Enzyme design. Structure first.
Site, PDB file in Angstrom:
ATOM      1  N   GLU A 121       0.814  -1.210   0.000  1.00  0.00           N
ATOM      2  CA  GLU A 121       0.000   0.000   0.000  1.00  0.00           C
ATOM      3  C   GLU A 121       0.859   1.276   0.000  1.00  0.00           C
ATOM      4  O   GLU A 121       0.512   2.314  -0.661  1.00  0.00           O
ATOM      5  CB  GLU A 121      -0.957   0.048   1.204  1.00  0.00           C
ATOM      6  N   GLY A 177      11.746  15.380   3.059  1.00  0.00           N
ATOM      7  CA  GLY A 177      11.849  13.945   2.932  1.00  0.00           C
ATOM      8  C   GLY A 177      10.910  13.412   1.847  1.00  0.00           C
ATOM      9  O   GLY A 177      10.581  12.225   1.852  1.00  0.00           O
ATOM     10  N   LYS A 195       4.803   3.810 -10.213  1.00  0.00           N
ATOM     11  CA  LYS A 195       3.475   3.739  -9.502  1.00  0.00           C
ATOM     12  C   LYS A 195       2.301   3.389 -10.501  1.00  0.00           C
ATOM     13  O   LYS A 195       1.490   2.544 -10.181  1.00  0.00           O
ATOM     14  CB  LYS A 195       3.271   5.045  -8.851  1.00  0.00           C
TER      15      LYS A 195
HETATM   16  N1  HSE Z   1       9.656  10.453  -4.125  1.00  0.00           N
HETATM   17  C1  HSE Z   1       8.280   9.990  -3.870  1.00  0.00           C
HETATM   18  C2  HSE Z   1       8.113   9.442  -2.443  1.00  0.00           C
HETATM   19  C3  HSE Z   1       6.824   8.692  -2.060  1.00  0.00           C
HETATM   20  O1  HSE Z   1       6.706   7.468  -2.810  1.00  0.00           O
HETATM   21  C4  HSE Z   1       7.275  11.067  -4.174  1.00  0.00           C
HETATM   22  O2  HSE Z   1       7.572  12.268  -4.264  1.00  0.00           O
HETATM   23  O3  HSE Z   1       6.087  10.663  -4.377  1.00  0.00           O
HETATM   24 NA    NA Z   2      -1.048   4.083  -0.680  1.00  0.00          NA
END
Ligand code: HSE
Ligand code: NA
Ligand code: HSE
Ligand code: NA
Lengths: 330, 323
Positions: A121, A177, A195
């Site tokens: 998830e 982060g 993704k």
């Molecule tokens: N580098 C990714 C981190 C989360 O998967 C982003 O900015 O979505």
């Molecule tokens: Na998710």
């Protein structure tokens, strides 16, 4: 009160946020009859300050086969792959936020995902429901999907709208982060492409290849281009789209010009928008990056597991799109 | 390849959409190694289902693999589903009244993973699965627009339509319960809120603790006054801590016009949680096809080997005395 033995791979921002969330919520876990015990935590440098006890830090790979769960947040593809395979082969589940690993090493990992051994998830839009959202949307037949899946680049575009520079916004996103260790992955659309691949595989084609996604990023965008879009009544975002072309699923990532009132344009977090038959139009939005946001995803999967539910399955077969689809590029 | 023997209770708009969706999507099911075989459809009023499959009287359910219920009401469906649940046969339902009012009888089976009820809140729009993933975090506040009929009516009254004229239009569209009172007085929202509370924060949450009121004080003039103030009024189902305990309420609320909840065209659930932050889901909360999508999602969930929707394992502590 049985031990829940967890092998954690990775002690950076996500692994630490995870370790600490587990500790903080350890009471909640007794409600399932368990107490969490970490067998060890794989880290690169045992000397760095870190909210994980020294005694648990491991600088070299450790035996995983006594674990009840492996949680992976160590970065890259090939190395985590070689470390998690022996555990998976032994029937130990994996919990991961590693979208690159799933996207690129699917030949090796698909058989274990098919058996309900992989929970991920947190690999799309962090702890925001995305995979569970699509698991429900399986009740319908997908017409089209469009998402703003990458947090770093949403943040950058949101800050550039306000006049801030690319470089300033990027540096901020790394401090928060949000960014990948290689931020190129973010800004060239590749992370969104990873993704998108995973969403395609869950929903419509369990073999969908990452290499088939056509990806471009935000490197041509500036404050001036976004200000010209605001005057046309539009917002520019980086959008990941899955739609039908000539009887086949086409996957693309690209900046798009959105009407400013569209759900995807108005979302403050990351967002996933689906049209499907017979449900209609459904969308989910929330924070798609950060340490806590990601750990929420990993912990949700830990609870899914402990409750007795299996991991995230690929689509049980490929199926073709119901209709020819088509947003305008910049 | 195995037969999946389905007993369907209800042949109304929902039952009918579900029957036709299952047959239209039978190839999807064979990719799980099953073929769908309806045993019968219990019908209240003797629709888009073959006459020979209709049953005017109850039928033995104990040889079913699955019972699907979209009958409405509480005690009649309860008595029909309980022998099936006792025999370990799962239940897929959209019946929020049943789950909210007969939880003393239904909870033990919910705890064993035998009840699937995504369609019971916001239809096939992800709501229960949304909260299942939100369990990664701890809830700070939940607010939803969980009834379609009253959303329709408020949206029409904004446009100057009267209450009665919007309600009738809602009735043609198929959104309203058979007695629209359950919609307009907030009861249907309060059934749904109860179900959400039991999943996320307190598995014993009683429907009777929900403080519910509806839209009866609202008119076109009230909604125009709100518009001039930059607000929209909606019927909102809230869950939040107050002095150490979870509270649930349904009531009309003045929302900022640009709030996600105010801008949603369908039903919506909005949550703040720790450490995730703010998340939101929206889509159609009513209708035959929307509901049927939910029930079929649950069927696929079941067939993939995943259990039904579990109550929270224990009541959780509120972190914030909100409002
Ligand atoms: N580098 C990714 C981190 C989360 O998967 C982003 O900015 O979505
Ligand atoms: Na998710
Ligand atoms: N009468 C309900 C049906 C959905 O459960 C509504 O308006 O939301
Ligand atoms: Na739902």
């Amino acid at each position: 009160m049985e031990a829940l033995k967890i092998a954690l791979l990775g002690g950076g921002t996500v692994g630490s946020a995870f370790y600490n969330l587990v500790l903080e919520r350890a009471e909640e876990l007794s409600a399932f009859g368990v107490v969490p015990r970490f067998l060890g935590v794989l880290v690169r440098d045992p000397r760095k300050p870190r909210a994980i006890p020294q005694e648990l830090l491991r600088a070299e790979p450790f035996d995983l086969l006594e674990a009840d769960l492996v949680v992976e947040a160590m970065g890259g593809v090939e190395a985590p792959l070689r470390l998690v395979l022996p555990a998976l082969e032994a029937g130990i589940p994996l919990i991961t936020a590693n979208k690159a690993l799933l996207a690129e090493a699917w030949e090796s990992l698909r058989p274990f995902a098919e058996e309900g051994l992989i929970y991920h998830e947190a690999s799309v839009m962090a702890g925001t429901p995305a995979l569970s959202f699509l698991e429900t949307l399986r009740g319908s037949e997908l017409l089209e999907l469009h998402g703003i899946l990458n947090g770093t680049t949403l943040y950058i575009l949101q800050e550039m709208e306000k006049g801030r520079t690319y470089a300033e916004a990027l540096l901020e996103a790394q401090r928060l982060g949000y960014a990948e260790a290689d931020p190129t992955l973010d800004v060239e659309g590749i992370d969104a492409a990873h993704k998108l691949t995973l969403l395609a595989r869950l929903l419509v084609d369990p073999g969908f290849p990452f290499a088939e996604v056509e990806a471009q990023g935000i490197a041509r965008l500036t404050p001036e281009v976004l200000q010209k879009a605001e005057a046309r009544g539009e917002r520019v975002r980086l959008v990941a789209s899955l739609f039908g072309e000539g009887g086949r699923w086409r996957a693309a990532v690209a900046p798009r010009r959105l009407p400013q009132d569209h759900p995807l344009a108005r979302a403050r977090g990351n967002a996933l928008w689906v049209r499907a038959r017979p449900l209609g139009e459904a969308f989910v939005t929330g924070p798609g990056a950060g340490g806590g946001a990601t750990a929420s995803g990993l912990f949700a999967d830990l609870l899914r597991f402990l409750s007795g539910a299996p991991g995230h399955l690929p689509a049980p077969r490929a199926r073709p799109p119901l209709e020819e689809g088509s947003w305008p590029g910049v």
